[PDB]
Amino acid sequence: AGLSVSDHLDGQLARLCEVAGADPVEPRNLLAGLLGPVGPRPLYEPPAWPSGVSDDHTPVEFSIAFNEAEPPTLRILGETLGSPPGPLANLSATRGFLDAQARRAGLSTSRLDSVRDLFATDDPQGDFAMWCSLVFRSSRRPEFKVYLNPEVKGVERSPALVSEALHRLGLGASYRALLDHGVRPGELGRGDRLTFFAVDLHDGPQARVKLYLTHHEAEVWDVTRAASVVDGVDVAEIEEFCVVAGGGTRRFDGRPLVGSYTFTEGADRPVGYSIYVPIRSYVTDDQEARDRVAALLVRYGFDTDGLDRAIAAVTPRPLRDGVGLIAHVSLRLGVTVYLSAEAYRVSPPR
């Protein structure tokens, strides 16, 4: 037959697993589950639905996280499209996949369950309600993360939705620090958007949430001021990261900078921060993006062999021949590289 989406993505994952030394059986089984009805869909058919997961609407994005003294972590972000694809049908299918995997792995989901009704709506707003992250490592069983849309009941309701969800979980003080002292003056739900509310599927020993903010048309000065509410972050290091990844850009007026905040029990400041540069918006092509990411990995004492092998695993195409393979690069206070499936489109060089 013609190639399917599964044919393309399953091959990418199999090769990425070898690069990371992760066992491929369970990851490839989980990707097939996550794809649902998209898996068998021919590549020569247009996307089943305009998924926001990736620019070409492939409903999956790969990433490789380089960790100080630990083998790289491979992750898949994506969603399961519904039977007639659509916002509510996609939520049902994605939650169906996750709930089946919770049951299979014997996970407790009481923390996630405790906030379900705050996100639940018959008329979900925006291009998703729930995404899935699958997390793979050498010598660990896969981990599941759930990405909820804070704007699912509309952008206006997002701050109150997040406030009430964090209060229920026994969090809220670090979040209060971010809303009162970490958001650009007069920009909440405007320039500063609540983009993801991310939790482990499995109840951990303590409540933990990763909140992602999108900083529209933002100065690095303002994004690092937002970051400065986090314990022990170096604003200089974040700016250095942004200068290298952005090629000298100070105003990210293309695709926006994104920050994530890790909220934990008993803390009044976030305990973790990541900056996500959408590097595809600030380069001519993937050769230039690869060169910038390699410079960042070298500065951090990482091996560029892992990066080049992960790139080659995803696609053999000349890096000069397009842009957006390297979709994002992020600094965690290690370095994470986000690699596009390009199942539908290779964005041309710019």
Ligand X SMILES: N[C@@H](Cc1c[nH]c2ccccc12)C(=O)O
Please list every residue from 177 through 216 that binds ligand X, using CB under 6 A.
none
Q: Tell me the sheet residues that pair with 338.
A: 63, 328
Helices (H), 83-199: 87-105, 110-113, 116-119, 158-169, 173-181
Q: Considering the complex, what minimum distance in angstroms separates the CB of residue 234 from ligand X?
A: 21
User: Taking CB under 6 A as the rule, does residue 130 contact ligand X?
Assistant: no
DSSP state of 51: -
Six token digits for residue 129: 């309600």
Torsion angle, CA of 164/165/168/172, rounded to 10 degrees?
Answer: -70
User: How many other C-beta atoms lie within 10 A of the C-beta of residue 121?
Assistant: 16
Among 11, 55, 10, which Cα is nearest to 30's?
Answer: 10
Nearer to ligand X, 111 or 328 (CB): 328
User: Taking CB under 6 A as the rule, does residue 259 contact ligand X?
Assistant: no
Distance CA 75, CA 27 (A): 9
User: Taking CB under 6 A as the rule, does residue 328 contact ligand X?
Assistant: yes
Nearer to ligand X, 111 or 210 (CB): 210
Give the number of residues in contact with ligand X, rule: CB under 6 A: 10
268 is in an annotated binding site: yes
User: Taking CB under 6 A as the rule, does residue 78 contact ligand X?
Assistant: no
Answer for which of 148, 258, 307, 323 binds ligand X (CB under 6 A) is: 258
Q: Considering the complex, what minimum distance in angstroms separates the CB of residue 331 from ligand X?
A: 12
Nearer to ligand X, 12 or 54 (CB): 54
- Please state the separation of Cα 233 from the chain's center in Å: 21
Distance CA 75, CA 186 (A): 35
Distance CA 327, CA 316 (A): 17
Answer for which of 62, 119, 273, 338 binds ligand X (CB under 6 A) is: 338
Which range in 47-55, 98-106, 284-292, 304-312 contacts ligand X by CB under 6 A?
47-55
Distance CA 169, CA 298 (A): 39
User: Taking CB under 6 A as the rule, does residue 54 contact ligand X?
Assistant: yes
Nearer to ligand X, 208 or 328 (CB): 328
Nearer to ligand X, 55 or 288 (CB): 55
Per-residue CA distances from 121 to 55, 110, 145, 328 (Å): 26, 20, 21, 31
Distance CA 308, CA 296 (A): 14
User: Taking CB under 6 A as the rule, does residue 62 contact ligand X?
Assistant: no
Q: Considering the complex, what minimum distance in angstroms separates the CB of residue 284 from ligand X?
A: 19
Please list every residue from 86 through 125 that binds ligand X, using CB under 6 A.
none
User: Taking CB under 6 A as the rule, does residue 52 contact ligand X?
Assistant: yes
Helix (H) or strand (E) holding 72: strand 70-78
User: Taking CB under 6 A as the rule, does residue 49 contact ligand X?
Assistant: no
User: Taking CB under 6 A as the rule, does residue 278 contact ligand X?
Assistant: yes
- Please state the separation of Cα 332 from the chain's center in Å: 13
Instruction: Please identify which residue in the block is written with the tokens 């599941």.
Output: 144
Nearer to ligand X, 10 or 79 (CB): 79
Per-residue CA distances from 346 to 37, 67, 251, 309 (Å): 23, 29, 26, 19
Nearer to ligand X, 53 or 314 (CB): 53
Nearer to ligand X, 75 or 111 (CB): 75
Q: Considering the complex, what minimum distance in angstroms separates the CB of residue 278 from ligand X?
A: 6
Q: Considering the complex, what minimum distance in angstroms separates the CB of residue 54 from ligand X?
A: 5
For the chain, counts of helices (H) and of strands (E): 11, 12
User: Taking CB under 6 A as the rule, does residue 175 contact ligand X?
Assistant: no
User: Taking CB under 6 A as the rule, does residue 252 contact ligand X?
Assistant: no
* Contact (CB, 8 A) for 283 and 247: yes
Cα atoms in the 13 Å half-sphere on the side-chain side of 290: 20
Contacts with ligand X, 136-165, as mask; x by CB under 6 A? ------------------------------
- Specify binding-site residues: 268
- Specify binding-site residues for Ca(2+): 268
Q: Which residues bind ligand X (CB under 6 A)?
A: 52-54, 61, 77, 258, 276, 278, 328, 338
